[PDB]
Design a protein around this ligand. Structure first.
Ligand code: VRB
Ligand code: VRB
Ligand code: CL
Ligand code: CL
Ligand code: CL
Ligand code: MG
Ligand code: MG
Ligand code: MG
Lengths: 150, 150
């Protein structure tokens, strides 16, 4: 019954992450072999759309950033409307409602498994260094558990 | 599969915990029905004794501290030789070269499962508030995962 164990870990990570940051949504965004992402687990505050089990293909990861995320890159955005993003990027976030986000990597067996992502849905938010470090550690601990369970 | 699964999580906690604190040893100290402890997992720096698989019958947990640890007690000692401990207690720690320690509980299903314990052996160490927080959160994250792998 290993498959249900993996899902239980994903659910623990999103619930604990939303509690740590007191934000509107936390998701696990997992990659397939095309680096298309699926929202495999979600904790979301009542009143905002559920991204659970949506499939979002964003080519920037495979084209530009996979190796960087494997080496510990993050994305911290206080206000996505002031970040100089293209309409294509904004259009993919608009159905979910994202005003600020924090993106940290999940690396398992030296591969980029996915991203643990926090959203503030309607207000900007300056993420503080301690919040980034706690959220990164949560992702790193969860990834290591998954690596050792096989 | 249960025991092998649980062991994978214990091995993760001790490796991550020693990395976080840059200390000399981290162990999971697991209680049986009588609160006799077994060192079921260990991460230890080269050159120090291994506590792995040792059974330590220390009665203070069952007689005095079970309730306080269930309710979140954390114990941090900068120098065990200046803390007023008795010879009986110190003789448990002297073979392992312990000089400072940090003790946090693992509570699963509202029951004291065990303790996650960090040791400095090279010298005394004043544990800092941020380090205690990260170590306690590691124990909490690990406990929540074990709780959900029923
Ligand atoms: C790279 C990029 N995409 C994302 C995507 C997400 N943020 C989220 O919160 C979620 C969950 C819903 C997703 C998915 C991030 C965070 C980043 C930044 C990576 C980084 O710099 O660290 C990115 N994607 C686009 C989309 C755009 N590019 C295209 O080729 C096409 C087609 C697009 C529309 C679908 C853009 C503009 C970027 C940033 C620029 C770049 O790195 O190439
Ligand atoms: C309570 C006590 N024991 C421990 C044990 C350990 N610390 C470690 O680092 C390890 C791993 C090697 C172990 C095992 C701790 C941390 C504590 C303190 C609890 C707290 O304050 O939260 C304790 N045990 C003894 C042993 C002693 N008492 C006896 O009756 C007999 C017999 C003993 C010899 C085996 C003592 C003196 C204490 C502290 C005093 C007390 O709280 O009662
Ligand atoms: Cl939810
Ligand atoms: Cl609504
Ligand atoms: Cl108990
Ligand atoms: Mg199982
Ligand atoms: Mg650190
Ligand atoms: Mg007594």
């Amino acid at each position: 019954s290993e498959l249900r164990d993996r899902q239980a870990i994903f659910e623990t990570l999103v619930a604990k992450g939303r509690e740590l940051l007191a934000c509107d949504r936390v998701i696990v965004y997992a990659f397939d072999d095309n680096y298309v992402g699926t929202v495999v687990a979600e904790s979301v505050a009542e009143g905002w759309p559920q991204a659970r089990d949506q499939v979002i293909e964003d080519p920037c990861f495979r084209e530009h950033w996979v190796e960087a995320y494997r080496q510990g890159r993050i994305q911290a955005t206080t206000d996505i409307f002031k970040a100089g993003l293209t309409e294509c990027h904004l259009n993919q976030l608009r159905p979910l409602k994202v005003r600020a986000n924090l993106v940290v990597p999940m690396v398992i067996d030296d591969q980029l498994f996915g991203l643990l992502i926090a959203h503030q849905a309607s207000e900007p938010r300056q993420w503080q260094e301690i919040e980034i470090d706690q959220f990164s550690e949560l992702a790193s601990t969860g990834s290591l558990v998954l690596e050792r369970l096989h």
